[PDB]
């Protein structure tokens, strides 16, 4: 058809790959993966175009809930009907329905008409103005994100009454176009030669070769013959490893490490040595090598695409068997591991409930730990990991009693399913049992910790796995999920070792929303014009002066086929956002090395709401960042599930690119160094430098608003002193510190995180003690706040570390190591009782403090 090969254009262009690179691997696994995914994304497809008005309502526009609502005050809203300039301004509850404000626009609507309306409430929802958001269900107004926000903002909610026949059409309009345990003899293989080696002549070539399961060695590393320093290296030797064929794990992997010596390290290489049928693998690899930058387990298990310049490692895998061998299937273990003994004393029982309550352990321990296996199944069901850890992966007959308990495991909590995605967990079935205890996430939890889950995706030994089709299936039933899934697939596919498996599932996603992929489509060609955009300013910058290179960025941006690229789409930073006409004349550019664009929208329909701003930025790796923002989105959910409100700013940050991303614009907010240059002719120029924040405020906050945001100003500050304390933000100045006209404080910039002390500034303190020199009530106030946000961290510490673990797969290069994770542990005290660790945050506070006063005492 014509349709499928422009289909399969459109899909290219996307995702930045083109289909035929594919095709041309003429590789199975990749073939089968297409296949499979392409048949069940298309599957979630049909589904969704016969959903229910009010299911399509939760597939296209998620409800955005306050974090206190998931698991009395009086307010203006302003109701208009679809395509009606005239609206109705009533006074409802915070605690009334949408039905009641729908009965309400509806009764309104009935007297204006003189008509005794037909239309009942049900048959409508409530969309936020200019906006791809909808308020609907049996949920009090004040529940509502958007609601709440308007609330404490003191601007009054805009909404349109929308009928089901027009959700209904918009359905329409989107719819897809019509016997290995017999083998006891030792593993080993053949290195035979090497390809395209480059070292120095005068050293020699080793070939340093381990097996692994995850993390744990299965038997000792084995190293090769040393052999003279040549780009052909020729080897043909036996490499044989303490280990039989018949207890080689399903998860078993080969890892190569070639380096030169006199340590010169030069490349590696890693090969599953099952394929993905099962099939323990036979006959001649040539495995293309990564470089270096000695062992790497984690490292991906396909070789390097870049054949023409990569060195290259052939191997031979002997022939175990004169038939194909298949590791044995789930019933053959089973009925194994059926087999075994189960009987300790009632002291003993003590020292196993203190172990598995307590993780690091002695062998002794470890021992009772696997004597004890069924206990820990029955009693202590939550231990699996501590079980796991314990099992000898080496030994089959182990795997298959671990396996057998497995089996019968009962579903764990999310949290505990977190820390078995971790790469230390490489069964296959642990891997499944995980994803079939994930399956209970909400999508507000699966949206929080959808970043670590694509980066699980980089420890993955197969392309067809479940988290693969778990991800596939939440992101075609949730557009807002699929929206950031693609997002974080595609800001990466200039990775080579991620380009493949990262392309397919794209394109699966694709096949599965042919209309949500024109939408991205729409998105990337408004990308493509900022990034050609900010390449000109970059240029025109280096030459002219900035009143020049503004308007020359005006004038090109003022171009029909720019003007076209850059308006009408939804936002990449949240797909609830549309960025409908570019206002030109206020677009700019920062004068920051990389020049990054300053873009600014407006919006008729939404009115003030439409008014919304974007940075592109282009030359800085914006993941780190990223990464930091939705840490401290995820603090500011826990503490709001707490009853505390920090007031918080987790403003957007989306890498869509190789070092190319947006940053979401917080309108009527300054830096600190801004408002403290201290300007003259100003409303806020202070006859000492310390009032210059408080006349700030005071300036845009008159009377009494003036309390409200100092109150705004201390609650924020308490929640970013210890957000950038638990995560180690350093190089905090003036300049990366922010202030809402609101009276909240906020940080840019996270360029720098996990120490790579706390801190209280007393320009800060001023503000919070209301411009006097001592105010211990004010001052103290804050204390209880820090206190307060600090002890509800630290009781979801493990979340935060098993969020951390997941995210060691991302390539971060402050967060590559455990040493880096040491800074998370440490401040977050989790060894200490929480007496304890409030006594270290207290001193360490009160240090800061005592560092804040030696700037008090001039
Ligand atoms: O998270 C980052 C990373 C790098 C730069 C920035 C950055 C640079 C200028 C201005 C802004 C603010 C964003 C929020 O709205 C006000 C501007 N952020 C933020």
Redesign the pocket.
């Known amino acids: 058809d014509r349709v499928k090969k422009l289909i399969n254009s459109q899909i290219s262009l996307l995702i930045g790959k083109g289909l035929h690179e594919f095709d041309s691997l003429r590789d199975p696994e990749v073939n089968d993966f297409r296949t499979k995914m392409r048949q069940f994304c298309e599957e979630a497809a049909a589904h969704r175009q016969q959903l229910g008005w009010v299911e399509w309502l939760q597939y296209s526009f998620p409800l955005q809930l306050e974090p206190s609502a998931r698991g009395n005050r009086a307010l203006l809203v302003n109701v208009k009907f679809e395509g009606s300039e005239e609206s109705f301004t009533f006074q409802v509850s915070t605690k009334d329905m949408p039905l009641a404000l729908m009965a309400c626009a509806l009764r309104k609507k009935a007297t204006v008409f003189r008509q005794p309306l037909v239309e009942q409430p049900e048959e409508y929802a409530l969309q936020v103005n200019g906006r791809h958001e909808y308020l609907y269900g049996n949920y009090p107004l004040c529940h509502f994100q958007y609601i709440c926000s308007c609330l404490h903002s003191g601007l009054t909610p805009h909404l349109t009454m929308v009928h089901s026949s027009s959700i209904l059409a918009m359905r329409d309009e989107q719819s897809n176009p019509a016997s290995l345990w017999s083998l006891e003899q030792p593993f080993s293989i053949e290195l035979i030669e090497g390809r395209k080696v480059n070292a120095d002549e005068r050293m020699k070539l080793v070939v340093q070769a381990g097996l692994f399961h995850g993390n744990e060695m299965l038997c000792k590393t084995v190293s090769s013959s040393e052999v003279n320093v040549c780009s052909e290296p020729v080897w043909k030797q036996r490499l044989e490893f303490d280990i039989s064929v018949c207890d080689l794990p399903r998860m078993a992997r080969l890892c190569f490490a070639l380096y030169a010596v006199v340590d010169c390290p030069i490349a590696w290489a890693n090969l599953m040595l099952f394929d993905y049928k099962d099939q323990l693998k036979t006959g001649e690899r040539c495995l293309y090598m990564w470089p270096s930058v000695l062992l790497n387990p984690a490292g991906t298990v396909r070789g390097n695409p870049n054949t023409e310049s990569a060195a290259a490692l052939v191997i031979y895998l002997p022939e175990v068997a004169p038939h194909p061998v298949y590791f044995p299937a789930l019933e053959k273990i089973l009925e194994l591991g059926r087999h075994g003994e189960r009987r300790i004393t009632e002291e003993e029982q003590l020292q196993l409930r203190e172990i598995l309550e307590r993780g690091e352990l002695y062998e002794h321990e470890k021992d009772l730990v696997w004597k004890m296996r069924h206990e820990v199944q029955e009693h202590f069901p939550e231990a699996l990991a501590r079980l796991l850890l314990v099992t000898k992966w080496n030994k089959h007959e182990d795997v298959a009693q671990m396996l057998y308990l497995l089996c019968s495991w009962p579903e764990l909590p999310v949290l505990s399913a977190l820390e078995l995605l971790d790469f230390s967990f490489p069964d296959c079935y642990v891997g499944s049992f995980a994803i079939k205890s994930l399956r209970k996430l909400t999508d507000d939890e699966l949206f929080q910790y959808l970043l670590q889950l694509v980066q699980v995706l980089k420890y993955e030994s197969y392309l067809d796995c479940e988290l693969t089709k778990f991800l596939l299936g939440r992101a075609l039933a949730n557009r807002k999920i699929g929206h950031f899934l693609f997002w974080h697939l595609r800001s990466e596919m200039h990775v080579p070792s991620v380009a493949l498996r990262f392309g397919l599932i794209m394109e699966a996603y694709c096949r599965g929303s042919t209309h949500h992929m024109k939408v991205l489509m729409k998105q990337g060609e408004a990308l493509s014009k900022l990034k050609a955009l900010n390449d000109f300013v970059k240029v025109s910058s280096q030459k002219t002066t900035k009143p020049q290179t503004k308007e020359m960025m005006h004038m090109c941006m003022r171009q029909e086929t720019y003007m076209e690229a850059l308006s009408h789409l939804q936002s990449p930073l949240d797909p609830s956002t549309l960025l409908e006409e570019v206002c030109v004349e206020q677009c700019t550019f920062?004068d920051?090395k990389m020049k990054?664009l300053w873009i600014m929208y407006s919006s008729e329909e939404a009115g003030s709401a439409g008014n919304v701003?974007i940075?592109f930025?282009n030359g800085?790796d914006?993941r780190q960042?990223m990464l930091?923002?939705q840490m401290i989105q995820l603090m500011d959910v826990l503490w709001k599930q707490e009853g505390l409100d920090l007031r918080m700013?987790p403003?957007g940050?989306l890498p869509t690119g190789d070092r190319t991303g947006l940053?979401?614009?917080?309108?009527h907010?300054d830096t600190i160094a801004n408002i403290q240059l201290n300007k003259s002719n100003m409303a806020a120029t202070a006859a000492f430098n310390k009032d210059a924040l408080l006349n700030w405020l005071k300036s845009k906050n008159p009377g009494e608003a003036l309390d409200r945001a100092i109150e705004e100003f201390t609650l924020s500050c308490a929640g970013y002193c210890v957000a950038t304390y638990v995560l180690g933000i350093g190089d905090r100045h003036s300049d990366?510190i922010?202030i809402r006209e609101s009276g909240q404080l906020?940080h840019?910039?996270?360029?720098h995180f996990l120490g790579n002390p706390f801190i209280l500034t007393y320009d800060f303190v001023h503000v919070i003690q209301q411009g006097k020199t001592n105010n211990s009530e004010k001052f103290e106030r804050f204390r209880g706040y820090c206190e307060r946000a600090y002890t509800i961290l630290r009781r979801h510490g493990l979340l935060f570390l098993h969020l951390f673990a997941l995210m060691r797969a991302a390539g971060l290069p402050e967060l590559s190591c455990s040493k880096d994770i040491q800074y998370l542990k440490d401040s977050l005290a989790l060894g200490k009782t929480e007496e304890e660790a409030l006594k270290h945050f207290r001193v360490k506070f009160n240090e800061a403090l005592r560092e804040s006063w030696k700037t008090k005492v001039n």
């Open positions: 920062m920051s990054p701003g940075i930025k800085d914006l960042d930091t923002l700013t403003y940050c940053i979401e614009v917080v309108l907010s990366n922010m906020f840019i910039d996270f360029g």
